[PDB]
């Protein structure tokens, strides 16, 4: 990592292995859901201002051999010449995104600019290597658990959209689509009530979550139910 | 994070992911009990002096997509014009609480002031987004376990008040209310003795905990009880 | 935390949450055994030179709501006027141990002195709030386990003295008392041999541990015992 | 560790034990698979710029007594005289790779050069001590699990090549070899389809993984299968 | 801890509790095997350059009350007068190894020298307090497990020599002794083959480990064995 020191000069320190392994362990593999690690790495590329060697550790630690390779070739394919167009000219490709340690000096504007570009291309590589295969069955398979809160269920449903479709569940144009899955795949008592809401067309995803919470939050405690049964006094 | 360097100049460093994940893992979700994370974030906003990007990591890591959205809209709704009144004027709202990365420079008084305001609005957003649904049954359901100390039980009871009522269990005006729940929901031997205390009306919550501890601390060890039984010598 | 920077100026940084949670998780609650956390906090108050806000995080993280309250009132009760005597004068109490954030500036001798006093009073508060209820049965209940080394058993026995009696097991005047519990509550083979030691009155606690280790260290391996049995050749 | 300070002077700090133990715990032992720890140490030797004492902690923590010994003798065997040839002259060997703490001062070009050489020789020692015994059966024993993704299986297969053969599975000359193992040892449905691919000779390892993913990603959900069975309506 | 700052001045920071607890948790107790913690503390005394208070935390965290006491008295017994001989003169003993916080100022050569001596005496104290009781049965009880590699077994065997004998298993004069235990206590197939090696007297401990690995590495996979059995075709 690099940071601007108190003396106006960049200062280097290696990644703590705890950060690298924490990032790995708190995310799905790149293959499972490329968006996760891509977003994490995009962030780190900014906050940690990694050098070329730092980037090798990032990639080497978070990606498998086969994933890293895909990303690196995708990054080299993203290089542009001075005319803003793709280039497969070895010298240009190598200069932008070197596969072997470059002589970039972070204390120089020249070194810094190469680092900026390298990081940008690395990100591009990951974005393009991503392309997670679609599988709508995975989205239909997200069903609210009997103890699962509506907001927790919605987050799992959105994660499935991200991983297994090309649709961003946060896009305004996807709201009715996510809303319909949310209603259909909520726990049955909740889904039946959401379906019956007055002016259903007018409900945002946030509205639906709040309405589902009212039903969920009306969970009718096990103890309460048992007490009712006891006080049933209806025999057979 | 930002801190005043030894040279009188602000110094930046990114959050350690271990801190972010520790904060997440040691607290309930925002939806479960908004007070928990809100108080943690209020503290961090001060001690860590986060930039706008840092705040995005905080929110992005500690809140779900749906929670973050609620908070961000609530924060924008908290923006005030120069006349101290609410404003929905896009330029004013955007200038105070930008949804996209602003050009705020922390080395400038201008940048610092925007950061201060941003953090204040973020906190407001969380406070207002909170509004955890009420559920008195949850408070009545907190019952002292057979091995649970009176002070540990009281902390669980207060946590239920915080999460599932609008009442602050630490307010002086709530003391008799919390006291009555504490007496009623203590383990039966303890509750019966607390109920019989002389000048019960005069007992603070702290007094009641100390009296319950005397009974609890009189637990009559299992070994002791067994020994007594053995030395029973009373046959049938 | 504060530390003297390389430039001769105090430098501030917030507590890592990992430290706070580690301190919490590696100790009993304050109520269970006040000495543990009190000693930890006394140490931290020195090494970490916490500000008033830092102290709020310490207390807020390591103590329950009810424990913190006890400590804070005990700290305010420990305030002394300029005549070295207790004072309940609101302005004096508030000035020494404020319940709300004070304007103390650590870059000023004035601020530093208030911080020193605050920390001293905080410690006093914890020491006085402590007063763990006595329970001799807990001390008598510490019995050496069949696999437990004599030194490990002695440490558990001393911990019970600390938590459940007013006697410090490290005091020279308590040595024979701890020694007698150690002999009586050691594993039976060990206790019978320690009781038979020549010049028993002359044995220190350290001597007794070493003598018990000789017996323990003569554990007669399970394998060895089994082998002996096999080579028994005595039939019925 | 050493790093260039903000003042243009090297700065020393000891390894955090968390890093050392994390490195140990996230890798196989040196004996099991020398490549793992060798690559980790090669990286650290650069990013952390360890002193001679730091190197002793690295080795002492990551290697067993017997492994460290092998490495140290291998490192001393890698020393070269000024004529670029091996030397077993005690003074030359001792000067390059001392077994006891040297007087190297990192603030001097002399000290720095010795440190550079020491680290280079340490790496050489590890590389040469490596020589993991071959065992082709271990490579043939890597079979894709019923829930295991093709990319995860390929990474396990490559790990076995690294640990139990002298062949680098990333070498271009090994691609058909790894490809054949990948096809043969994939789950049976996948392997049969990969074997039937048109222009199979033209498929890279990456192509084969993508083709296997299409089959795997066609997993035919358990729920789906069950539903089909239910709707079977074919009785006996 | 202390370190030389970038400004040529010592800089202080308290131990992270994570380091202290990691050191504790990754080692046997002092009583179990004094060598472990003694070596760890000897290292830390150098890399972390602890003050007197830091040393109290080290000892207080890594040793039990009874162990620390032994160490402290042993350290005071190691103090030497200006004539290089032992001294029990209170003032000399107290000046070298104070039991209560001394006024040592690390910014002074006087303070630094006392710190150096204190650390040296602390180490001496631990070395002398060590003296782990002998128990040859423990060494004979180290037997290679059926899945245990020869190098892993040898490390466990050496650990038993360290903990339960006065012999250093790394001494050149102990090699044949450790070698004989290694051969005798290896898994039976391995031990029988090592015993039959040509020029056995000439085999180093490293040679024996490599020969045992050849046999172990010839483990004859369970799958392989099963396959052989199946293809047995010999019926009864």
Give the overall silhouette of chain A: elongated
| Cα-based radius of gyration of chain A, to the nearest Å | 25 Å
The fraction of residues in strands of chain A falls at: under 5%
* SSE pattern of chain A, N- to C-terminal: EEHHHHHHHHHHHH
Strands across the major sheet of chain A, in which order? Answer: 1-2
Number of contiguous helices of chain A: 12
The multimeric state of the shown protein is part of a larger assembly
User: Could you give the distance between the termini of chain A?
Assistant: 73 Å
The interface involving the most residues is between: A-B, 34 and 28 residues
SSE-based structural type of chain A: mainly alpha
PDB class: viral protein
Keywords: MLV, pentamer, viral protein
Entry title: Mature MLV capsid pentamer structure in intact virus particles
Chains A, B, C, D, E: Putative gag polyprotein
Could you characterize the architecture of this molecule?
The structure is cut from a larger assembly and holds five copies of chain A (236 residues). Chain A has helices spanning 17-25, 34-47, 52-62, 65-76, 90-96, 109-130, 136-140, 150-164, 175-185, 188-195, 205-216, 222-230; strands at residues 2-4, 10-12. With 236 residues, chain A is an all-alpha fold. Chain A has a two-stranded antiparallel ribbon. In chain A, helix 9 (175-185) packs across helix 10 (188-195) and helix 10 crosses helix 11. The longest helix of chain A is centred in the middle third of the chain and has 22 residues, at 109-130. The first copy, chain A, is elongated, with a radius of gyration of 25 Å. Chains in contact: A-B, A-D, B-C, C-E, D-E. Chains A, B, C, D, E: One of its GO terms (biological process) is virion assembly. Chains A, B, C, D, E: GO terms for molecular function: nucleic acid binding; zinc ion binding. Chains A, B, C, D, E: It is found in: Host cell membrane.
